[PDB]
Amino acid sequence: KPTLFSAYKMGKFNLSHRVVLAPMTRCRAINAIPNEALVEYYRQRSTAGGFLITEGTMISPSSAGFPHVPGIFTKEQVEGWKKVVDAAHKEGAVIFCQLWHVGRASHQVYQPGGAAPISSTSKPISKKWEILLPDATYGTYPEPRPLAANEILEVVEDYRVAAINAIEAGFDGIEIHGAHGYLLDQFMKDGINDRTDEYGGSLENRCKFILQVVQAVSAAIGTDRVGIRISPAIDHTDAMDSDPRSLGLAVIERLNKLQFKLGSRLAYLHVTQPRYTADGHGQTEEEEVAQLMKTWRGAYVGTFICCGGYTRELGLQAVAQGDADLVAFGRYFVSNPDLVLRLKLNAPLNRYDRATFYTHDPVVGYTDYPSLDKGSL
Numbered sequence: 001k002p003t004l005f006s007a008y009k010m011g012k013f014n015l016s017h018r019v020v021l022a023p024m025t026r027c028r029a030i031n032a033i034p035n036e037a038l039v040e041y042y043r044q045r046s047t048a049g050g051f052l053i054t055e056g057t058m059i060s061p062s063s064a065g066f067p068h069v070p071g072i073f074t075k076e077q078v079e080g081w082k083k084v085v086d087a088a089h090k091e092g093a094v095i096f097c098q099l100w101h102v103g104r105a106s107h108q109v110y111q112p113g114g115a116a117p118i119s120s121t122s123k124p125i126s127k128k129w130e131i132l133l134p135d136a137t138y139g140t141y142p143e144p145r146p147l148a149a150n151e152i153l154e155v156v157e158d159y160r161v162a163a164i165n166a167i168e169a170g171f172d173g174i175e176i177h178g179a180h181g182y183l184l185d186q187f188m189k190d191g192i193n194d195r196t197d198e199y200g201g202s203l204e205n206r207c208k209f210i211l212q213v214v215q216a217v218s219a220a221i222g223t224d225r226v227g228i229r230i231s232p233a234i235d236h237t238d239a240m241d242s243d244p245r246s247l248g249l250a251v252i253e254r255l256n257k258l259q260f261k262l263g264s265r266l267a268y269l270h271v272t273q274p275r276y277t278a279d280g281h282g283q284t285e286e287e288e289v290a291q292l293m294k295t296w297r298g299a300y301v302g303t304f305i306c307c308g309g310y311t312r313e314l315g316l317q318a319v320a321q322g323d324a325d326l327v328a329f330g331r332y333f334v335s336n337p338d339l340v341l342r343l344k345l346n347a348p349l350n351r352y353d354r355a356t357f358y359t360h361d362p363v364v365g366y367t368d369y370p371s372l373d374k375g376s377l
């Protein structure tokens with residue numbers, strides 16, 4: 001029976017264990033160019049047969065909603081990524097690039113020519129939420145501009161190009177970021193999408209954009225090199241759906257149908273879940289969310305990655321009970337470069353410092369968290 005530390009065939013790829021580096025924005029790619037800091041960060045976290053998912057990576061200039069996040073839409077960016085990917089591969093890692101467009105979760109200071117961010121809607125994120133600005137202050141999310149149909153197709157093309165560029169950089173595949181209230185989620189969630197055209201209304205219409213993206217990148221680089229991340233039950237930055245269960249199942253039904261039509265499976269479905277503890281890890285002393293995650297996994301035909309507040313014990317149980325094939329860890333991987341070894345040994349985990357999640361130093365709070373002492377053989 002599978003355990004968290006068992007080998008796994010993720011279609012094309014052989015993994016040696018089920019512990020995954022969750023995608024995490026860290027803002028060390030100064031002026032959007034992957035650099036020596038990113039090389040060392042991913043190298044430190046690489047293991048033989050371990051799966052890595054990168055930080056969200058811009059597909060276009062309008063994709064930006066954080067400072068110093070990498071892109072993969074220029075040759076210069078691709079050349080920077082090659083060095084990261086080569087180092088991870090030297091350690092035996094498998095690595096996917098997460099393709100990211102923030103949509104309305106942006107600010108004029110991040111947009112070319114100071115243009116309004118783009119979205120499904122003209123409705124801004126409410127003032128309940130604020131955005132980190134490049135000068136280390138927090139600002140107000142502005143009114144976005146609703147995309148026309150032809151402009152949505154332009155963004156689909158941006159995803160296609162980014163996927164091709166990822167393969168040129170040597171990535172094993174890409175992950176479509178369709179979670180956390182960003183552009184594709186702004187179309188999926190009925191709390192945001194108030195369109196009256198073919199991209200609004202029904203679940204079919206609301207899932208249209210993300211399915212067009214999946215279809216385009218699958219054609220470009222192959223189904224087996226494409227993963228997809230969603231979060232139907234996370235309502236971060238005013239991104240709520242009235243029926244998360246049905247939304248998740250609607251995406252899944254369409255992924256299943258596409259796989260059947262094309263004749264092959266996607267690399268995986270990746271779902272991130274909310275937690276209800278004070279620190280956002282583990283479970284309290286909702287079963288609703290747990291049931292939802294198992295329902296979605298049961299419905300999806302293929303590899304399922306779970307993420308969000310997983311602990312060593314909950315990760316062990318998720319794989320042992322068949323709730324997930326792979327378990328991704330975010331915050332613990334920030335502070336534990338050798339997280340896989342620590343989980344295998346049930347060693348203590350380094351505390352993580354939220355204050356340097358999104359700062360820009362190549363060392364401080366980024367690559368200077370220690371591994372366990374390996375000694376000298």
Ligand SMILES: Cc1cc2nc3c(=O)[nH]c(=O)nc-3n(C[C@H](O)[C@H](O)[C@H](O)COP(=O)(O)O)c2cc1C
Pocket residue numbers: 022023024025026055056098177179180229272280281307308309310328329330331332357358
């Ligand atoms: C600093 C930080 C940056 C993150 N950046 C991304 C991102 O770029 N793309 C994404 O899909 N999720 C991102 N996440 C969400 C994580 O992938 C993960 O789902 C979340 O941290 C919950 O998992 P955890 O409990 O193991 O930390 C980020 C989380 C943090 C804390």
